[PDB]
Amino acid sequence: VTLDFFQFKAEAADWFKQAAQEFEKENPDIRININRVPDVITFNGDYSFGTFAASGVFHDFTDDPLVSELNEGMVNIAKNLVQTSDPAKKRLYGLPFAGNASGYIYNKDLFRKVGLDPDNPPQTWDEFIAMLKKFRDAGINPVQATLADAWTTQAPLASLAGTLVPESEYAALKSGDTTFKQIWTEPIEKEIELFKYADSEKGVTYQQGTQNFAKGTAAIIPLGTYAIPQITMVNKDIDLGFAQMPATNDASKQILTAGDDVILTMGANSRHKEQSMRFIRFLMSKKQLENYADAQSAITPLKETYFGNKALEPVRPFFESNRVADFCDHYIPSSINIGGYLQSAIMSGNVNQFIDSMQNEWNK
Ligand SMILES: OC[C@H]1O[C@H](OC[C@H]2O[C@H](O[C@]3(CO)O[C@H](CO)[C@@H](O)[C@@H]3O)[C@H](O)[C@@H](O)[C@@H]2O)[C@H](O)[C@@H](O)[C@H]1O
């Protein structure tokens, strides 16, 4: 048989191509075509995933023997993404394959240039902003923006909201006991502040920005762990770090936004379920998982967490202490153009217009 493998992740295209070919060598009865439900699917762990899960597009993995070896936190993330109001319908419709974190990637060599300690990034908002001013004052571009790709603007919001806005607030928001004005004003104000320290053309693509950063022209790029491989492929010698973006001056209560970066699933109505499951068990072996995590600087979904790049060391404490949070935008319906509104808020500085757009679309 031939399996249709829908693979969402641009940054990992080569890894999955090679994994599939390796699987084919050992399984001559199975061919894998990488892109009528596809048989095997990778999807980002977000609202869209949850909506397709609730509609029955995906196989129900809840009882699968593979689950017991997985990080329970990541499994529950996947289950809670299901877009349903019935607690009982929060079933597992995919397997966590890799985790991420949102914050910022920084150039350790530029840290050293201005006397900052590359192993101890800023712990508070004031210290974070002083760091950017310090880079500017020293003649270094502090922040590489990538606004032409709207989704990238969601990262600093998600990072910041991770600490400022408890996930419980989204239930209060739906029931109308709170508002975007009340919960997202401070995150968006600070995201605007952040990008005032982008001293180069802000309106460039994700690829352009990752190229710029790799070539040493910016101190930080405020994206999550998923961007690391895009950077290292442009310059293998870049000395990179990854850090939590501190949203307040309460150093003791900082939280790291972190989610299921890749969920691996199967089409509920595949005609080749046995073969599909065989490929999925191959991808979910520890060996493959850690190999993937090394290639993509990701976090494995096994109970004994493996970090794929030493750049992630500064955020290890957040994971160990369970001081993490899922992305704010996982509570925002896909029909709401959050990306577009955010890119307008960042460029224009018009907070009122951003909040009202979010609130009115939500209310509807
Ligand atoms: O903060 C941005 C984003 O982070 C998380 O998703 C990471 C995901 O983002 C990018 O994938 C695309 C690129 O268009 O963005 C959507 C998800 O927002 C994906 O469907 C799409 O492939 C990266 O290119 C991926 O490598 C990466 O996995 C978070 O889950 C998102 O909600 C959002 O906040």
Side-chain angles (χ1 to χ4, degrees):
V1 307
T2 296
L3 310 182
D4 292 304
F5 179 7
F6 177 89
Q7 204 295 96
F8 91 95
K9 187 185 260 281
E11 298 89 338
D14 188 59
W15 191 92
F16 284 111
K17 178 178 190 188
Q18 295 308 313
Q21 291 174 177
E22 177 176 349
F23 180 84
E24 292 183 316
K25 299 299 178 306
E26 279 303 305
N27 297 275
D29 54 313
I30 301 173
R31 297 289 173 195
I32 299 170
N33 176 71
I34 296 187
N35 166 26
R36 72 181 60 95
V37 72
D39 303 285
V40 180
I41 300 162
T42 57
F43 227 70
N44 189 54
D46 66 3
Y47 190 102
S48 174
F49 170 79
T51 300
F52 285 127
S55 294
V57 181
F58 306 137
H59 178 73
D60 182 342
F61 280 85
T62 302
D63 294 321
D64 200 281
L66 282 164
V67 176
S68 73
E69 298 173 10
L70 308 185
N71 177 330
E72 291 181 0
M74 291 180 69
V75 171
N76 296 337
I77 279 177
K79 295 183 175 146
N80 280 317
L81 283 174
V82 179
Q83 290 304 308
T84 178
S85 60
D86 182 336
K89 288 185 180 297
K90 241 85 192 210
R91 321 264 301 158
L92 186 69
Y93 287 103
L95 302 171
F97 174 87
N100 59 34
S102 194
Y104 69 94
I105 299 157
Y106 60 95
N107 189 325
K108 290 179 184 269
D109 284 334
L110 298 175
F111 261 50
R112 296 174 185 108
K113 205 169 217 284
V114 297
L116 296 167
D117 184 349
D119 300 311
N120 299 286
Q123 294 174 314
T124 60
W125 177 249
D126 284 2
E127 282 174 356
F128 175 76
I129 296 297
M131 207 213 71
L132 305 182
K133 288 182 184 173
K134 183 182 252 284
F135 278 120
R136 171 180 281 167
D137 286 347
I140 294 156
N141 183 20
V143 181
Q144 179 62 71
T146 52
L147 263 58
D149 287 296
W151 70 263
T152 64
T153 65
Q154 296 171 232
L157 182 70
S159 295
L160 293 167
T163 293
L164 286 160
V165 180
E167 300 179 66
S168 48
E169 293 290 338
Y170 300 101
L173 186 75
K174 185 177 202 141
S175 69
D177 301 328
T178 192
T179 64
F180 281 98
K181 182 174 177 77
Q182 286 174 58
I183 60 176
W184 279 15
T185 291
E186 193 170 351
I188 187 61
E189 278 177 347
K190 289 180 191 271
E191 185 170 4
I192 293 165
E193 192 169 355
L194 168 64
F195 284 115
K196 290 196 308 185
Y197 293 95
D199 297 349
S200 60
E201 185 175 3
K202 297 189 277 277
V204 301
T205 67
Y206 177 45
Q207 291 81 9
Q208 187 62 60
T210 57
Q211 288 167 23
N212 286 359
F213 177 81
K215 293 175 188 164
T217 71
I220 78 163
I221 185 165
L223 297 177
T225 48
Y226 46 78
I228 290 174
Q230 289 277 103
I231 293 166
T232 55
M233 72 171 292
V234 176
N235 183 344
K236 66 195 175 62
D237 296 315
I238 189 64
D239 196 17
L240 289 182
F242 179 81
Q244 183 261 7
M245 186 181 290
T248 62
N249 290 310
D250 184 346
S252 76
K253 281 182 166 60
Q254 292 303 308
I255 298 169
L256 182 72
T257 300
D260 291 351
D261 190 63
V262 180
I263 296 180
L264 181 60
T265 191
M266 178 179 59
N269 294 335
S270 163
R271 287 144 47 247
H272 308 126
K273 296 179 169 73
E274 284 185 343
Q275 292 90 346
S276 290
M277 285 304 310
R278 278 164 58 200
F279 182 42
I280 285 181
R281 297 187 193 100
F282 167 85
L283 292 175
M284 300 291 299
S285 75
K286 179 176 183 181
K287 177 194 183 298
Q288 288 307 307
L289 283 170
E290 302 198 335
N291 190 275
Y292 176 91
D294 283 346
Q296 293 283 311
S297 296
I299 299 158
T300 62
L302 297 188
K303 279 180 176 167
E304 188 196 323
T305 302
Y306 176 81
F307 297 83
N309 188 322
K310 60 178 181 189
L312 266 38
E313 285 304 317
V315 301
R316 175 170 294 212
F318 287 94
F319 287 106
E320 294 192 343
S321 61
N322 246 70
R323 283 171 27 253
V324 291
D326 200 27
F327 290 74
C328 58
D329 59 22
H330 295 173
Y331 295 89
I332 304 300
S334 314
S335 61
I336 301 180
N337 188 21
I338 186 169
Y341 298 146
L342 286 165
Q343 70 193 147
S344 282
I346 292 165
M347 292 298 286
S348 81
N350 196 335
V351 175
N352 293 343
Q353 188 155 46
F354 173 74
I355 292 296
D356 286 355
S357 289
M358 292 300 310
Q359 188 68 57
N360 291 330
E361 287 294 332
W362 177 267
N363 279 357
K364 288 169 190 174

